Amino acid sequence: AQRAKGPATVLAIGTATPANVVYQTDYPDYYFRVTKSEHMTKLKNKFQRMCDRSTIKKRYMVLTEELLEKNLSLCTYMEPSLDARQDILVPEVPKLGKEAADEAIAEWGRPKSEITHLIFCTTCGVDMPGADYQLTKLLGLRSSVRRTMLYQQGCFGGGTVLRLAKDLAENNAGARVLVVCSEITTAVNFRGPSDTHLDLLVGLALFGDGAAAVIVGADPDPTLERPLFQIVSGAQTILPDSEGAINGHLREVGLTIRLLKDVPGLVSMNIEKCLMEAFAPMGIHDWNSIFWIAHPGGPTILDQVEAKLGLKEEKLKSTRAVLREYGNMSSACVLFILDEVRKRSMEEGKTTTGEGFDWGVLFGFGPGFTVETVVLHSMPIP
Template sequence: MASLLRNQIARQAAAINGSTRRGLRAEGLASVLAIGTANPPNCVRQEDYADYYFRVTKSEHLCDDLKDKLKRICNKSAISKRYFHHTEELLGRHPELTSRKCPSLDTRQDILGTSVPELAAAAAAKAIAEWGRPATEITDLVVSSFSGAHMPGVDFHLANLLGLRPSVRRTMLYMNGCFGGSAALRVAKDIAENNRGARVLVASADLTLVFFRAPDETHADTETLVMQALFGDGAGAVVVGADPVSGERPEFEMVSASQTTMPESGHVAQGRIREDGFVFHPSKEMPSLVRENIERCVADALAPTPMGAFTSWNELFWVVHPGGPAILDSLEAGLGLDPRKLEASRRVLREYGNMSGPSVIFVLDELRRQQEEMNEMGVMVGLGPGLTVETMALRATSRPTN
């Protein structure tokens, strides 16, 4: 009798625990409820960048061949302009930022410790305003950045700048590079779906000051010129939540999210923080790795999802990190995409350059303006060091009805 009673109590306890757990979770999938983006005011056109760069780094004494090399890289970049927090005046006040012989990490950290949260706050404020509810209703904050490292971090300062509640649950993602924004959205999806009523603010902000430096006089450092020619500054923010309430306007349902690493790719995109800032080593192998592996990565990520049957990748819309023209061309070729499918990514690259983590949020923002022309189902692809592929299946929920 005692044994039967214990078993009955255990079954009742399990049922109660199961019911309690289900009651704490959302009923539906997480959705994108609002988007905001921001850039610093300093804008430099790509056609002027080589002259600008050699002037602000006080490198005009170097031979013309080096400047010509940067001009060729800029001409092939498919970028028309970029935005930067650092200005000619700021660099003039801190000559250590452009000298390869002086330690500059302290100066970079001091500047980034303030400027990164401020730019993230500008984007987040726009997202919250579009969402239409008070900032104090944000329950969770997920922040991504590779620009500097502080404790307390960007998340702490951003919460204070926005006036979030002291009880907001903060998650800080550092040093994920170009897939940082996608990773933050994946974390936000998990939080929103496993906590009934949660409203998650995602913010991703990156500033190129972390790796800005003068050219190498030996001509051996082409990597520096590539980095200076492609990257720009920006911040993106997204409000994420499940089970939308009155007044909320879901834009995209976040169907599933996954992460995978391309085989034998750990050496192709490496970076380290040094005394002269963040030193990143891109590799010429990246485009070929993307072309050869992207279809398998995306297919494996979508296989267990309820995406429905489709016979061509062109039946989906695409939100792809604009890492550069070679990366976009390789992904397009690897998936056999119609060139129009990556128009949003190419437009963001053209208008802002590669902003690292925030870029994919800019592409999502750009794509939603074209919703009358896009398919119902789509895929977000974040690419970054590792070589890491973040994949999220999306469903457009605010498409106009015929």
């Protein structure tokens, strides 16, 4: 007694974005006009080809042109701008998180009065008390909620929350977990004018804004609840020879991020061990008998892994589709793909929530270099 019986299960997935839709075929011109950098045609040609090959069609952004008119230090590179970003992030991150959590509880079907725990994860902004307290007040959750604040974990937080919510739901009987990952990549936005920092541009051509939420609980009551995926295990590892792959320093100019390693080649040369160690308890070594959710850090990191593993084109269709219509939304991005995996599984009438396959993987890649591999099991679809 006192503790749960079976595995953690995701019971609802809600997504939320801002109203501003920004098409990528226009974003180079916008970005070099707003920044007033029309004279640097070298970086303009470079940033253009970045967005052209990013496979992204549209992205949602809190940062409007008006918000930059009122926060002109964000049209600058290495000028003091931390307060200008935090005056946006501290309020705007819980607000987008409430929208996604409300969509998730709406699918959940049960009142918020029974949410026992809360895990909030963001890389954008930092404050005391954390965005978990802000979301608890904004959503009106029980004041008895016991919260976990994951600050500045990076694009692998989406698997961290699942690996943590499994133990929270399974070690406390009748506990239900509100998981929210809300990221506003206004944490990443500087003036173009820098031949001193070109990785800033492939970061601006890929990231977008959005919030995702799930409800996690063990031993679901199959009258009020509908199971979607059950989290069998969650793993975290440090890739060999990956020291300094991504370095993010939070200074008075915001979070400055610098890359030292070729990340897509690092993920490719090391992912097969992560699939082998995670799928060993089941005896699975064919990665095309598995449904796939991997954080779309970029087009080619999925391209190279898809080539190194010899995967079919269908495996990463949902991943690439979230990168297409939403882009990179950091940690929340993998939960978006979880939702698309379920939505497309019904739209195309496949046997189970994971496009027809029993077992599935959730990959989150971030600083370390760190790979979070989470193995899920599907739910049948009648």
